[model samples]
Target: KVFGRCELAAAMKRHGLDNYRGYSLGNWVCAAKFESNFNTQATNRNTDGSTDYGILQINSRWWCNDGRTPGSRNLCNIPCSALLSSDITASVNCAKKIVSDGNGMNAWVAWRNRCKGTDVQAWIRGCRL
Candidate 1:
């Protein structure tokens, strides 16, 4: 639980992530909520034998490597364990890179399925950012 709503907003802004790469801050917040519930230690093993890592739930097939997993593209050039840390700097940077790679927030399936075209204002409701 690295961030509450306000903390997340403030942190996102501090990291230059506010409205980054044309995706709204709410999109990032909502995606993080649905994907990892703000827990940096979150990890999920998909039925496809791939694992999603960290608060953003980045996929192993294209992003970071979990060591045991083979054929990871590791585009972020960091280990998956790095994403599970409480410090979100590396994760956020990697996420920004992912968004910049033409996927936008659509890189996160949770955002596409749950937050797309929805009212996400509440994600930053009490945040002073």
Candidate 2:
């Protein structure tokens, strides 16, 4: 299957999932945006310069077990690293969970605001639907 925007949308529809044009798409955008600016190849360093990998920002130290590297797995099959290994479905699922945790984009928006100097927890507390 050609796994791009069209295929992805088709798959979502086939699974009875919300369309990207729906409210859930906001969640997808939020995590991808905040974590890696939607860069599937984004990699960053922690305070100690540890490598954080992938679009979902799954850290190498935490997720890079089993000798798999980023961009090694297919984007349609993995997270965001050497090849998208480590369960692509899980990565997308986690993004959905993060967004749903505090009412769609509210949690992500709080994360953004907090990083910019506003209190994140406070914003989270007041997050609404």
- Reference-based lDDT, each prediction: 0.86, 0.43
Q: Per-residue lDDT of 34-128 in model 2, one digit per residue for the tens? A: 66654555667656434555555655433443234434323233333542432345545544544444454443442355343433222123223
* Model 1, global lDDT: 0.86
Alpha-carbon runs more than 4 Å astray in model 1: none
RMSD after Cα superposition, model 1: 1.2
Candidate 1 lDDT at 100 equals 92
Find the candidate with the highest lDDT and give its number: 1
Residue 54, candidate 1: Cα error in Å is 0.8
Query: Per-candidate TM vs. native?
Result: 0.93, 0.40
Model 1: per-residue Cα lDDT over 36-74, one tens digit each: 999899999988778999999988888898876676689
Count clashing pairs, candidate 1. Answer: 0
| Count of clashes, each model | 0, 10
